Subunit: 266 residues, 4 copies
């Protein structure tokens, strides 16, 4: 459908859009914001090239999507605790080991190399919608146990307060309904998902592995090639991403805010 | 669980029993047969050593378990069409590509080498019972598509009749035994192609898990054949694996097939 | 690069090349830079071109012989130019002598959808440990078209005997121009490792398929009308994304020859 | 075989040996036949024995040195005799540089059924790989460690630990120090990765090898009886003690015989 206040160029037939004709330094009238949000909900990952915003403006824009909150586990900028920094992998979405993972993240590209460092995204809506009705009926009711044990718990510690938070488990549905759109998507990721609730690891592995692979098929993905000035927003519920490491040695600087969400619900 | 008419020695803690104190040349009184059948239903694969029976007696004994019928795609003995031969692998149970696979089979060892040629069996009841309640609730409702396409259909043809080999049937993933009422897993690697309504790629993880789980050594027994062993297996609640190892040694067994009904949930 | 502008697409492979009009024939020093860029970046494209079938052919001929591929559609009056109207693979590895390269011309595109991915099989190989490299170095692989148009494809319900015909290629190939070792394996045509069984081959091949298509070794080309694109058929694989269903897409294509893949 | 009776269990491995009383010491020609049988059949057992701890030890010593294994229970007054009382395919303690060459196990108390032990022939496992697959893995070494059994990985499923984490390296294919026969040397409990490869690289290959080596056709199954004395080669077999008895009392004793570091 038509967008009168913004220009929306989809990136692929499945997800992602470039949005122009907006200056994120200016606060946004109701009808313009509504179109941004409409675009966010359809395309799931959106970016706005050529922006030149400050830390306060970044914050302010992020706040139109939901509460923003300093995330500990990241560095965070001098004088602006809400803005985390990224500088110098596996498919995942952010922090699903929490009861209430982030709803979204807004990332600002400050310094980029001429090439390298692309970020991939998939649509977990499309992931779910491409399973057969029988497969959907089969896993619809399952919950999954998430935990950070491989990232900074005891499994990571194996290798060759900090640990107990890494080992702490939470439970989320295998399929979640988006709190704004009402659309079902697959909610599973390879970094944090440990097993299916009430099953053993050996029972869970076949199914989870299938789901990990299925959800990252190239046809469900888009690729964002970063440019200085890109402000990018991803839905943390209905996408996964993969920040490509390839640049090796080239300096890359982005800032990032995290917008909060509610418990994932079926 | 005392047996007054027969001697029942379980082979393992999970399945299989040797049964002695019976002569299968003699027809069997009601109370003795009932004990045999009681033992068949608990132990799932049973054998009777030291028998010396004829083709008619074999047939007759088989008929106490259910109808017996010549199986086409057979060798079959001269003058006795119901008795198939076995002479000179993967875990499976017999002919699940049929709408109505056999209920059981009774095998008679006529000539054996001194060692080699053991046959393994697993309990699909125990296979099912060892899955978690969540895994059971998850697959309970699924059906599986069976077909002979890898054995004598078009897929077999690719490795360098066909339409009967490719013909598909559908069975539940979990079946209730028609006599005992016990649920067992009903899946095998030779005939099961995919889960009904799913794609191959969707089915593969789950089926593979189920194939491996059902053949764990702890659910198995091993029968070491002796000339004169008469053996009966339930074709619904077990799978077996005839070990090829003898290479070159002559082995001769006869076999009857007892019919069954459509597998039901 | 004095005669052309080369913008790499990623840190690993792919370049946009501008400042050239492919209607004009190319002096020696300019061609040499194109070819230098082709060999480093492995898949290159030139936006904004407006060329005819003869010019396309001519440009393709600078990379090597071009020859009608009789297995494919082919344009009216121009037998060398095939028309185009999924899994990771490279082209036709079931031949003893697969193409060295392909030059593809985008004539009609939808506004979005239909991207094509590429990976570097050089980088795929270079990221295996020295022990894993020493282990598979010596292996050959059996390729055949049996899953695409042989008897296996036929299952599922001469064309067939050519589909079933097997050839053998090394698992690691040295590029005949660059001298660089790359991995040479693909999921569509590779059937088993030579002298092994399928069951023996499966673990190893599967690992290699997955490893070679890691996002970090890939680039993604988003087609535009007028793009002329050249890929090395030896040291890359590609994946034409289906995501457009019903949108009309028209590209032409020439196929350039090369030598039998060699260790 | 003039001095003993040898009944093979399967066409591939295992033999029952009768016509010997292990309380009596053994003349040269008889022992030689036992040892000949051990080397061909790889796991051998002698039913109906009634031996003491000293006799057990003595018999074990004919196969090689026997030595107390610390980190197992060990009997009162007889440090060489470990006890087994109340799973995955493996062979014993391959995390050592020098794992045992063999083990001699004595069944003292058994339930009437349950508790069978499986064995496979790693010779046959190796011999059934294609020549190309053999040439491909011939040169590889494997890293072994006890980290999943009693090291840090085991610890994660909530000194002991540093010995559990200690790694050693063994060939993937070993030549038996007495028979000269090549067998596969890989097991799922202790083998962690292939030397110089990553875990992700190693997994396909190791997994294939685990499965291949335990095919029923390479296996035998020993159904224990009170009085069985059983000897397995720890280099050229793996075993799997079936748990199927829960609560039935099972008592066996065990001695461990030394050998040489596994070599190509």
């Amino acid at each position: 459908q038509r967008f009168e206040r913004i220009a929306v160029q989809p990136l692929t037939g499945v997800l992602g859009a470039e949005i122009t004709g907006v200056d994120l330094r200016e606060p946004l009238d109701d009808s313009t914001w509504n179109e941004i949000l409409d675009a966010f909900h359809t395309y799931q990952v959106i970016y706005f090239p050529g922006q030149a915003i400050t830390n306060e403006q970044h914050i302010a824009f992020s706040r139109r999507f939901g509460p923003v909150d300093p995330v500990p586990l990241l560095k965070s900028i001098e004088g602006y605790p809400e803005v985390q920094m990224i500088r110098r992998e596996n498919w995942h979405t952010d922090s699903t080991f929490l009861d209430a993972p982030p709803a979204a993240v807004v990332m600002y590209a400050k310094e980029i190399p001429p090439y390298g460092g692309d970020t991939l995204f998939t649509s977990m809506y499309t992931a779910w919608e491409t399973l057969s009705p029988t497969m959907q009926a089969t896993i619809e009711g399952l919950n999954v146990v998430h935990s950070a044990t491989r990232v900074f718990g005891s499994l990571y510690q194996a290798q060759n307060m900090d640990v107990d938070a890494g080992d702490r488990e939470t439970v989320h549905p295998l399929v979640v309904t988006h709190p704004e759109t009402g659309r079902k998507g697959l909610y599973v990721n390879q970094v944090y998902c440990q097993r299916i609730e009430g099953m053993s690891e050996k029972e869970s592995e076949p199914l989870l592995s299938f789901l990990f692979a299925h959800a990252t098929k190239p046809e469900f993905t888009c690729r964002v090639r970063w440019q200085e000035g890109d402000v990018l927003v991803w839905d943390n519920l209905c996408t996964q991403h993969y920040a490509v490491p390839d640049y090796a040695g080239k300096f890359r600087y982005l800032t990032r805010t995290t917008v909060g969400g509610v418990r994932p619900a079926r």
